[PDB]
Amino acid sequence: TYLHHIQKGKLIQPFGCLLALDEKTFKVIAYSENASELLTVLGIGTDIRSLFTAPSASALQKALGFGDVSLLNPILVHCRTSAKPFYAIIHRVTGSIIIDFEPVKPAAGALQSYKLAAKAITRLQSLPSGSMERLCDTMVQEVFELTGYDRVMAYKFHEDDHGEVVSEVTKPGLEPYLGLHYPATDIPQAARFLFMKNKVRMIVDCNAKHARVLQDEKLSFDLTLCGSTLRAPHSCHLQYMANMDSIASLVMAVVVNERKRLWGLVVCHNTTPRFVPFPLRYACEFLAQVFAIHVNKEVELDNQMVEKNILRTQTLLCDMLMRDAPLGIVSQSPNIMDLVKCDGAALLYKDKIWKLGTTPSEFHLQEIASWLCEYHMDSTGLSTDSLHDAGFPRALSLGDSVCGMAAVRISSKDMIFWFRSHTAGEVRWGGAKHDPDDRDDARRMHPRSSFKAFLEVVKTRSLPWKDYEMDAIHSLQLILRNAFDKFTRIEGDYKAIIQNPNPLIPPIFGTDEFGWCTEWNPAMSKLTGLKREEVIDKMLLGEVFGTQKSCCRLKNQEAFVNLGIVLNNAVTSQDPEKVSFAFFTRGGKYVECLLCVSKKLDREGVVTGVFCFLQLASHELQQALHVQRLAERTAVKRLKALAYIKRQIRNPLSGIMFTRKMIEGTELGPEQRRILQTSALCQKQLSKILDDSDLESIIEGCLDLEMKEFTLNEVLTASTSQVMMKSNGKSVRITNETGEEVMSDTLYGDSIRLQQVLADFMLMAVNFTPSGGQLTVSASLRKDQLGRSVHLANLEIRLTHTGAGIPEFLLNQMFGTEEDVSEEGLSLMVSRKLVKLMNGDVQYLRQAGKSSFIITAELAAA
Amino acid sequence: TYLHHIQKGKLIQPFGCLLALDEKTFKVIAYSENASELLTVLGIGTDIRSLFTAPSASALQKALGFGDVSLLNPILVHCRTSAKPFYAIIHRVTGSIIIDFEPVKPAAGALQSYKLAAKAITRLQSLPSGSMERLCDTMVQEVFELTGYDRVMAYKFHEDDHGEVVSEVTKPGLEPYLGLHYPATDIPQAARFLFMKNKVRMIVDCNAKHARVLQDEKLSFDLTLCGSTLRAPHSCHLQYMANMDSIASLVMAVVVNERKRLWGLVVCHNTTPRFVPFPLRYACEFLAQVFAIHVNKEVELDNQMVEKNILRTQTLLCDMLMRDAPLGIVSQSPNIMDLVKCDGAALLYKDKIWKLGTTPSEFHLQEIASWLCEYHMDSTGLSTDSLHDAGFPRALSLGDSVCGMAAVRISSKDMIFWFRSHTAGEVRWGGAKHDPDDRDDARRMHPRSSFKAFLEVVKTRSLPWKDYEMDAIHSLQLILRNAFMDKFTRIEGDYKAIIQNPNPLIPPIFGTDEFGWCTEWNPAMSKLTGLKREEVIDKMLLGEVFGTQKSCCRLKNQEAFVNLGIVLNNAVTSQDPEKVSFAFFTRGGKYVECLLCVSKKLDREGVVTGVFCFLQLASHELQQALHVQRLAERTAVKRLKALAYIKRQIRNPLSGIMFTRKMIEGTELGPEQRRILQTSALCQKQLSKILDDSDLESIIEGCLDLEMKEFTLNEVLTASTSQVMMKSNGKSVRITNETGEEVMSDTLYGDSIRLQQVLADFMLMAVNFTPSGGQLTVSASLRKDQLGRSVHLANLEIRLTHTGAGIPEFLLNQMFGTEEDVSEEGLSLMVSRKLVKLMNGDVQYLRQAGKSSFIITAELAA
Numbered sequence A: 001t002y003l004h005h006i007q008k009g010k011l012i013q014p015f016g017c018l019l020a021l022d023e024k025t026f027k028v029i030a031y032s033e034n035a036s037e038l039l040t041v042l043g044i045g046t047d048i049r050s051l052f053t054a055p056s057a058s059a060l061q062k063a064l065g066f067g068d069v070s071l072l073n074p075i076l077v078h079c080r081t082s083a084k085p086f087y088a089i090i091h092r093v094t095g096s097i098i099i100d101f102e103p104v105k106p107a108a109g110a111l112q113s114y115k116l117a118a119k120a121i122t123r124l125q126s127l128p129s130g131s132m133e134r135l136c137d138t139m140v141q142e143v144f145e146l147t148g149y150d151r152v153m154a155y156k157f158h159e160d161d162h163g164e165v166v167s168e169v170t171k172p173g174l175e176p177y178l179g180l181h182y183p184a185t186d187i188p189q190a191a192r193f194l195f196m197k198n199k200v201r202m203i204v205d206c207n208a209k210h211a212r213v214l215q216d217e218k219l220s221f222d223l224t225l226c227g228s229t230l231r232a233p234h235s236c237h238l239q240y241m242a243n244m245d246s247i248a249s250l251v252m253a254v255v256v257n258e259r260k261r262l263w264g265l266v267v268c269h270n271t272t273p274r275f276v277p278f279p280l281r282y283a284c285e286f287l288a289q290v291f292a293i294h295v296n297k298e299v300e301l302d303n304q305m306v307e308k309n310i311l312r313t314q315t316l317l318c319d320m321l322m323r324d325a326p327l328g329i330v331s332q333s334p335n336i337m338d339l340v341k342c343d344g345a346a347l348l349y350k351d352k353i354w355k356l357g358t359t360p361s362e363f364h365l366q367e368i369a370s371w372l373c374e375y376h377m378d379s380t381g382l383s384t385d386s387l388h389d390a391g392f393p394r395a396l397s398l399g400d401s402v403c404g405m406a407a408v409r410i411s412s413k414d415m416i417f418w419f420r421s422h423t424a425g426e427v428r429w430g431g432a433k434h435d436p437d438d439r440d441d442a443r444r445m446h447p448r449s450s451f452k453a454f455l456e457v458v459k460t461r462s463l464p465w466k467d468y469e470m471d472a473i474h475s476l477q478l479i480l481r482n483a484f485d486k487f488t489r490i491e492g493d494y495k496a497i498i499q500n501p502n503p504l505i506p507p508i509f510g511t512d513e514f515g516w517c518t519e520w521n522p523a524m525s526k527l528t529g530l531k532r533e534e535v536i537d538k539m540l541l542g543e544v545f546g547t548q549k550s551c552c553r554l555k556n557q558e559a560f561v562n563l564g565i566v567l568n569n570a571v572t573s574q575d576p577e578k579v580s581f582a583f584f585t586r587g588g589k590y591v592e593c594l595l596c597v598s599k600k601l602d603r604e605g606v607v608t609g610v611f612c613f614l615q616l617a618s619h620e621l622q623q624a625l626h627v628q629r630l631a632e633r634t635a636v637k638r639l640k641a642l643a644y645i646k647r648q649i650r651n652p653l654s655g656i657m658f659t660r661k662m663i664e665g666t667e668l669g670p671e672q673r674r675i676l677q678t679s680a681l682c683q684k685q686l687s688k689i690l691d692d693s694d695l696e697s698i699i700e701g702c703l704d705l706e707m708k709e710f711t712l713n714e715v716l717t718a719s720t721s722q723v724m725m726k727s728n729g730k731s732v733r734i735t736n737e738t739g740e741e742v743m744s745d746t747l748y749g750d751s752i753r754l755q756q757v758l759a760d761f762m763l764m765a766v767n768f769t770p771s772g773g774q775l776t777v778s779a780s781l782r783k784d785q786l787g788r789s790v791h792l793a794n795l796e797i798r799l800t801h802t803g804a805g806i807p808e809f810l811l812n813q814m815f816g817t818e819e820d821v822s823e824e825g826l827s828l829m830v831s832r833k834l835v836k837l838m839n840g841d842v843q844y845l846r847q848a849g850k851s852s853f854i855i856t857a858e859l860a861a862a
Numbered sequence B: 001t002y003l004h005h006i007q008k009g010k011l012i013q014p015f016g017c018l019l020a021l022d023e024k025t026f027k028v029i030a031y032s033e034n035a036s037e038l039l040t041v042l043g044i045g046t047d048i049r050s051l052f053t054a055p056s057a058s059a060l061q062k063a064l065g066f067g068d069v070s071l072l073n074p075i076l077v078h079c080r081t082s083a084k085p086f087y088a089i090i091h092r093v094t095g096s097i098i099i100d101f102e103p104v105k106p107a108a109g110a111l112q113s114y115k116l117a118a119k120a121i122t123r124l125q126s127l128p129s130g131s132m133e134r135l136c137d138t139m140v141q142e143v144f145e146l147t148g149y150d151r152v153m154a155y156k157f158h159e160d161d162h163g164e165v166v167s168e169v170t171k172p173g174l175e176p177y178l179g180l181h182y183p184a185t186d187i188p189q190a191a192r193f194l195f196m197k198n199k200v201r202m203i204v205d206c207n208a209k210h211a212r213v214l215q216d217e218k219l220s221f222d223l224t225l226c227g228s229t230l231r232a233p234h235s236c237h238l239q240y241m242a243n244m245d246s247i248a249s250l251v252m253a254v255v256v257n258e259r260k261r262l263w264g265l266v267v268c269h270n271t272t273p274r275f276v277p278f279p280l281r282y283a284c285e286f287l288a289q290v291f292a293i294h295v296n297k298e299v300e301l302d303n304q305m306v307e308k309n310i311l312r313t314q315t316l317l318c319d320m321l322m323r324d325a326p327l328g329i330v331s332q333s334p335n336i337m338d339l340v341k342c343d344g345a346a347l348l349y350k351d352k353i354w355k356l357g358t359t360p361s362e363f364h365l366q367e368i369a370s371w372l373c374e375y376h377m378d379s380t381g382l383s384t385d386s387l388h389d390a391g392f393p394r395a396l397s398l399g400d401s402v403c404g405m406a407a408v409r410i411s412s413k414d415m416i417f418w419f420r421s422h423t424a425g426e427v428r429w430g431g432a433k434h435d436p437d438d439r440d441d442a443r444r445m446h447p448r449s450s451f452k453a454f455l456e457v458v459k460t461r462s463l464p465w466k467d468y469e470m471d472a473i474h475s476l477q478l479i480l481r482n483a484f485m486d487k488f489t490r491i492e493g494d495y496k497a498i499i500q501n502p503n504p505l506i507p508p509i510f511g512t513d514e515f516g517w518c519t520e521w522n523p524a525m526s527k528l529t530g531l532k533r534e535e536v537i538d539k540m541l542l543g544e545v546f547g548t549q550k551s552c553c554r555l556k557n558q559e560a561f562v563n564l565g566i567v568l569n570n571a572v573t574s575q576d577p578e579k580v581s582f583a584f585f586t587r588g589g590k591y592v593e594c595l596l597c598v599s600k601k602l603d604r605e606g607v608v609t610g611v612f613c614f615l616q617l618a619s620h621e622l623q624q625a626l627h628v629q630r631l632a633e634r635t636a637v638k639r640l641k642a643l644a645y646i647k648r649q650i651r652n653p654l655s656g657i658m659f660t661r662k663m664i665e666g667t668e669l670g671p672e673q674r675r676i677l678q679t680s681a682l683c684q685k686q687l688s689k690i691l692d693d694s695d696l697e698s699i700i701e702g703c704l705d706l707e708m709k710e711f712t713l714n715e716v717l718t719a720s721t722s723q724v725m726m727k728s729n730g731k732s733v734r735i736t737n738e739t740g741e742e743v744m745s746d747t748l749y750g751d752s753i754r755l756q757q758v759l760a761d762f763m764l765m766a767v768n769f770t771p772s773g774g775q776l777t778v779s780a781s782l783r784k785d786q787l788g789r790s791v792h793l794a795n796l797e798i799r800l801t802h803t804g805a806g807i808p809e810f811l812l813n814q815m816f817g818t819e820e821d822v823s824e825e826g827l828s829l830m831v832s833r834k835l836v837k838l839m840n841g842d843v844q845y846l847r848q849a850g851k852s853s854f855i856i857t858a859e860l861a862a
């Protein structure tokens, strides 16, 4: 096996010395070949104190007999002959305690080494939780500057033990490996087992004259070098790295629960032999642990969202109970589409179909019913990843517009559909497509010699239907049957995997106008142990949910008062009110749930009682809303100011609109009419900025552009108009030099947003240009040198000024370098991002003592 | 006694009839004289089914069998003779059941009764917590409009059982009772015991001639009337109410926990006889229960505020440990004055005195030091509310500047003092001072006839010294004495020499060196951890003292180990204290959840030499208070930065519009061109003024400063018209100014932008709700002859006009503040309401037949 070969390896990488001391007599029994030429007699049986100085021996011996030596590493020792600084790393092996010596090429202890990554941890913790891509990208970015390798990657393991690169930052000029998939056999289980114990592997150069550990034959024990930091990599990996042209590597390890699972590895490559000091490697261990800490939060947050999707679906399902059976679930605002994520829905009732979105034709839906009625008659529901895989003869007749389906037969020949469109199943492989039946074998020596990308075309399929999604469809099926259980799941392989669902209806209990209980759901009975008959007429507040001598017991008197308040506030507002409910069951179980209480309305429209139900949220979920509940009104109390300001700023903006519009009627000067056109564009800048409520609403998401005709002559004129008043006041000379043929180009990009981006960028030069200084604006389409045959475009704007350049603090705050942003540099961060959405990036460069804003943009048009 | 007299009372108020039925045979065992004339034959042995209609009798019979009959009260019944409505109040007594009937003079059950207080409940929960005065003030307001009594009071019970009025709202033209104290003799302990059972007690007529309840059953059981709502008030209290001139009363008992203590009472008075229907009385019971819960919450917040002060004192004390010298404890702003709430503090150290704040003279302080040197040798501390009470021979010389003092014996001659100034101890009694030697006497027949306020002057003392404040300064004993068994003498209230043992508040402290080994382990830490300092010194704090496995103190998991390392390294970089959570397992198994404060330790040479970690032990409720504070702060800094970007990026296009207007001027413009330009001018200043005064923190709750600028009336109408002309011209409504040519040409001086801003949104609110037809007319008037123009003032009247039904009042009343719903149309009017109101004017809607009109009158000068 591979593990047996790795643990029996007797070769070490020629960048250090490995001396092993006996556990009992505390003298060397094994040594590396290069020890004599690097530590200076090196013969076996000489105490280490002979080969070092007095402070080194005392420091080593004190930690030699320590309990756990992991934290004391690294240890700075000096040789007796020349006192050349060495780093000593000590790990204990049952055969002999092994010390690895690493020269200190021109931080002692675990805590001091962790300080090297302190700047990286403060960047990971100060991150918006929720997005795993941002967490992965910021971790690879930190390692890139922390270790200084040519290419840093985040290799994430999937369920099939194969991996995919989720993020990558490299030096410019290197081919990107982002998105590539690699076989599971590339990293065997021997390496996966050791990565949970070593957690850091470093290779200085894949072509090195390996040294030999010449342990004496008199040693009864089988000394192991698996845990050492100097272990020579296997010959297959040396050729594997040579094929990828990665001479040096530093592979990290991420373990979710330090149950425990190797989430992935952080791979740092280098085309040249690279050496990294041990404190940095130890620091990377801490950073990986912090990364694994935050990874476990993202999976928890994902688990919270899937719980909120169930809760939101439960809220929707209760609403569909009150609505009319055949047509109520369609006419209202929350449709059947909101129940299950879909691109369309249909409802075949009374030989009539109620299309609700991107659904097949009316004729085609009838043929869907014919296929369902015979091929899958036994099952009342069906879910298919792809309709062609199911066996539909005319799957291709309706095209690739829709390929998934989740249909349940409520009654007779009436069925309700749920259509899902296809997804881009394009996956790129690293040179070998992983397959389930491949297994690691020790006979293989040379790996694949080609690493070119493989484009594996996956058959046309939609997203797989989630397990919780299927119960939501089944829950509506129960609702519709009453208002008037085997499910087929053709997913993946062509196998009719029959399943039964779990009803997702919430525990529902109702009250009449006076207070007597009226309804008691079976889900309510199973949660509390009280049958429907025993709580069918007793008062809810007093006898059913009461403090003393009650069928269900509340915690204290506050619960009694709180329950009565909610049951009375329901009549005032029909909208559901969410409150925390807790009570004891007949068996003494303490349950914590979230109570939704809403009015019950009859056909006449009068209050006929209260319809309420509980949401069985988890303890972690309950605290999430409860904490947010303390600041829930902040979205209303504070929104008054934003709504008032936006409303109060809109009134005189309209006054500006009416005033200048009427000017066009009157007689105007020949060149004077041009002010109206410039003023109109600036006016539209106010209109669009008012629509954008917050910058925080665009940084995490994407601020959509505008597809409109647009000429470059006006925007530069409009952008200059904003900054002339500042420039004319504090003297600043401004000139524009742009292509005359570009005025008639009439580009298809956004005009108001690009004007805004250039407005503050041009303001930047004015605020830092000395009196009388210049300010040049340029433009260059360069349509003949970017491949305009394939529909694309290019753009560039230059902003040069005098004044020895702008200060560093304002300049550094762009590109998300410094976390804190000033009241002045935040706009530049938004402005820089606003051209990132335009496939461009702004840069700075100082030439001849001048400045330059190299802002680039691309016009994605067709 | 008083309780014995009440328990054997056979009189009831002539406001209803009382019928007592036996438990088994259900026959009338007792009745009142008024029953025959109110329920019609009637007598003992009469079945109650023969007094009402069949549907009503069965409803009563159903309630008689209910286990908890307080739920079904009240019950609406009708007499069979004439179907006269009645309310049945039922309560169970061991001897027999008692039924109270109440006439109905033009909600059945407890739930529907609570609906009458639903409006009052929502203005108690939606209250910003922190002060009991606001909660007490609003609760009195709820009962005032609900019950409609002449006056409503909040009577708080103090420790000595005497009461104090803490809140009061009355009908206009009364004598306020706020702040008045009343002796505990007024409310006997017998009445307090009954209030824990009968929450609400009502007296209708003070001079009513009670009708005796006849009971000639010759049975063993004695019929008690304590629980009946019809019970006759005691003879003494009947004369007690006559002196107060309060015929009717409605007292509500407030019990904090239902440990169970009567917090106080809510008293309602009415000069005329008053009747409150039972549902409102039951609703008042629910309101008291909600008030009781909120009172406990206010107490809990007050208790947490004390804990925060202890944590603040603990954090301050840790700084004094690192502070250099007894000279230094004065220099830095975290001085002794912040340690204890005091008006002054003086430190005596080696024949030199340092004073901070309001302290006595140099010479008097020396005698103060000499006074303890000859009076209180045994005690090392002192605490006197008043120095005159303590025994200073020259106490009067110090004056009112300093009256109280806390003293500390740092050394034989070293002393450090604190001073508190005299506080105005004004308490007004109701007419009889309450003395502790007063006991309830059952033989008393007439109460006091004088209720005028009697003012008792309390002796000149200071604020009462708290237990933790004397503890805080004792914690300074150990810190100062160590860096250089005991008794503390307290003089409080009556002259006494109480000796108490203080328990020092020094928090647990542990520190490490630059490598990781522990350097300190406080005795407080040893008690909490169970580990002696000997077993922790010279051992790694991370991994050997605090660690997951094989460690002295066991962390919960790898989460704590990583987090502890982060805070121990961020402290070196960040000198400021870091507030993080910390949990660890004591060797005894205790899971100590606490907060960790880490600050780097600086040597005298200025080089870092480790960390200084101390713990703030906080309850499970205090920790979440800071946790939600950060999350409340989590969206706080974001909106400031988000608004500062929207505000900054709207200013730039405004400068562009300003520049275009400044350049549209040209060489010269036509007669109308500059006029239409002028309308654009004042419209732009409205854009700038709104941005400068954004977020409306002042115009909504304060007196925003206005601008007095030479103004002309004619421009304000035209500029404000164009803002609303866009929507008006486009739709069916029209705008036509009323003839004011003489007065518009006439000049009045005011704030153009502020008046136009108010006028602009008032017209837009009009055009919006004009029902797609009719004309809008705006008029004006200048008043300088009708009002005195010799006062250098003038009156301006602006009158709008509608053509339609009229804006709804439930939205119009929102601008006056009566209504608060989610509709921005009323929000804008309310904010502008104070803006004109700031101009010594008012705004008034004036309804009419065809032409609904506004009225915007403001005070304008010249």
Ligand SMILES: *[C@H](C)[C@H]1/C(=C/c2[nH]c(/C=C3N=C(/C=C4\NC(=O)C(C=C)=C4C)C(C)=C\3CCC(=O)O)c(CCC(=O)O)c2C)NC(=O)[C@@H]1C
Binding pocket: A002, A006, A153, A155, A163, A177, A182, A185, A186, A187, A188, A191, A201, A202, A232, A233, A234, A235, A236, A237, A240, A244, A246, A251, A265, A267, A444, A445, A446, A447
């Ligand atoms: C030999 C025929 C087979 C083999 C054996 C093998 N592989 C490892 C360890 C690693 N393999 C890795 C693969 C990658 N390297 C990359 O750069 C990328 C993607 C960009 C991948 C997927 C990685 C990483 C490791 C860990 C490196 C390390 O330091 O251990 C080993 C263990 C080496 C050792 O002696 O310790 C072995 C025996 N790998 C093959 O690809 C073929 C099938």
Ligand SMILES: *[C@H](C)[C@H]1/C(=C/c2[nH]c(/C=C3N=C(/C=C4\NC(=O)C(C=C)=C4C)C(C)=C\3CCC(=O)O)c(CCC(=O)O)c2C)NC(=O)[C@@H]1C
Binding pocket: B002, B006, B153, B155, B163, B182, B185, B186, B187, B188, B191, B201, B202, B232, B233, B234, B235, B236, B237, B240, B244, B250, B251, B265, B267, B444, B445, B446, B447, B448
């Ligand atoms: C009789 C010699 C003594 C006495 C007896 C007494 N008092 C009560 C009940 C109350 N007395 C109250 C006093 C106040 N009333 C007020 O309006 C104010 C302040 C504004 C005060 C301090 C109050 C209140 C009550 C409770 C009234 C209720 O709800 O019942 C009683 C019990 C009456 C009964 O028959 O139940 C008795 C026996 N009070 C005196 O002042 C004299 C000394």
